[PDB]
Amino acid sequence: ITGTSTVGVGRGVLGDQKNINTTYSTYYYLQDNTRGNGIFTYDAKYRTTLPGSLWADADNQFFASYDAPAVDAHYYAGVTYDYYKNVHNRLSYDGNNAAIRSSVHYSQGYNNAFWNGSQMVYGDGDGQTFIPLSGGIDVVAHELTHAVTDYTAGLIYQNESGAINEAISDIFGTLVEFYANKNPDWEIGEDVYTPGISGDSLRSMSDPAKYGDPDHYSKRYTGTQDNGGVHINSGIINKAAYLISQGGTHYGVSVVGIGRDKLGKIFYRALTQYLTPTSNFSQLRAAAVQSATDLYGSTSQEVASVKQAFDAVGVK
Ligand SMILES: [Ca+2]
Ligand SMILES: [Ca+2]
Ligand SMILES: [Ca+2]
Ligand SMILES: [Ca+2]
Ligand SMILES: [Zn+2]
């Protein structure tokens, strides 16, 4: 809508207060004009019809419990946009400031969130397996990174290339969590998964096997579930990425960490320069090595740590 850019205040899913960018024209809408061509948040009102209605509010105050997922989806889309702009010089997901759109209150008791090809969608959860999914910044950034992947490498959502696709979203979802820097960890979804159980998460990058996910190529899932295990075999790549950043010894191979910034720069380059739609794990290794070579030299510690980390998870 056309109006005056302004600032509202609201409470998110976890009860924390934040400021959000809004647009005023009779109502106050969740439209943020300060970022590229805009961030737009919609109410799907418990239906599956998308996008729903652009979020309208009478007083620019978003403290109703019904408002909370909209506040978070809107605010964390913001932070994610900022991460890509400030750290990798990418303007929105298409690289040309495309509008970011999100719908919340999608369906009823829906325990997921997804990028549908054109927008993010967030369920409310059923109140015991999940609370509203936009409450976790790693989740929001994971979903938005899918949009990024679709516009660059375009990894097919199947088998190994799908696992890479999922791993890239977890990796940057985690980097974005560290960027916004409030309780960052190497777990996925910990803020919104099982509200009545502390210490757990949906997936772990530091130890994927914690939840039964492979952490070595020899343990990869080769059946047909989950599109050939795109959320399962990603644990192998997630583990490599964790090692590259933080270091450690894994299956007897030792890896010197090079830290988060470099891991981000390497994986973003691999993603935007060398990965293609059918890249498999072995090609991801070559892409990451080549990336680190471009950035730090063939005989750097960085190239050596990348090699170390893929040897550790059994990927040649
Ligand atoms: Ca209000
Ligand atoms: Ca966290
Ligand atoms: Ca996390
Ligand atoms: Ca939990
Ligand atoms: Zn995903």
Binding-site sequence positions for Zn(2+): 142, 146, 166
Alpha carbons 4 and 264: distance in angstroms, whole number: 36
CA–centroid distance, 182 to ligand 2, in Å, is 7
60 CA distance to ligand 1 middle (Å):
5
Measure the CA–CA gap between 111 and 60, rounded to whole angstroms. 29
Sign of the torsion angle spanned by Cα atoms 311, 169, 78, 270: positive
Nearest to 28 by CA among 73, 65, 61, 69: 61
Which residues make up the environment of ion ligand 5, defined by Cβ < 5 Å?
166, 169
Distance 49 CA to ligand 3 centre (A): 30
Secondary element (H or E) of residue 255: strand 253-255
**Residue indicated by tokens 């974005």:** 176
With residues binned 3-state (H G I as helix, E B as strand, rest as coil), the percentages for the chain, rounded to 5, are 40, 20, 40
Method: X-ray
Ligand closest to Cα of 164 equals 5
Please give the domain boundaries of the chain with CATH numbers for all domains.
6-154 (3.10.170.10), 155-315 (1.10.390.10)
What do you get for the CA distance between the two ends of the chain, in Å? 52
Please tell me the number of the ligand nearest to residue 167's CA. 5
Q: Which residues are annotated as a binding site?
A: 57, 59, 61, 138, 142, 146, 166, 177, 183, 185, 187, 190, 193-194, 197, 200
Which residues line the annotated binding site for Ca(2+)?
57, 59, 61, 138, 177, 183, 185, 187, 190, 193-194, 197, 200
Cis peptide, bond prior to residue 51, ω within 30 of zero? yes
**Ligand 5 centroid vs 257 CA: distance in angstroms?**
25
Residues annotated catalytic, as ranges: 143, 231
Pairing relationship of beta strands 31-32 and 120-122 according to DSSP bridges: unpaired
Secondary structure (DSSP) of 129-185: SBS-GGG-HHHHHHHHHHHHHHHTT---SSHHHHHHHHHHHHHHHHHHHHHHTSS--
The Cα 30–Cα 52 span in angstroms is 13
- As a whole number of angstroms, the distance between CA 271 and CA 291 comes to 9
Longest dimension (CA), the chain: 64
Considering only CA atoms, give the Rg of the chain. 19
Resolution (A): 2.3
Report how far ligand 1's centroid is from the alpha carbon of 77 (Å). Answer: 20
Those residues whose C-beta lies under 8 Å from the C-beta of residue 89, and which sit 6 or more positions away, are: none
> What order do you get walking across the sheet with 17-25 strand by strand?
56-57, 27-29, 17-25, 4-11, 61-62
- Rounded CA gap, 67 and 20, in Å? 12
What Å distances lie between residue 208 and 160, 191, 269, CA to CA? 17, 18, 25
- In this structure, how many other beta carbons lie within 10 angstroms of the beta carbon of residue 246? 17
Between the CA of 103 and the centroid of ligand 2 the distance, in Å, is 23
d(CA 312, CA 239): 9
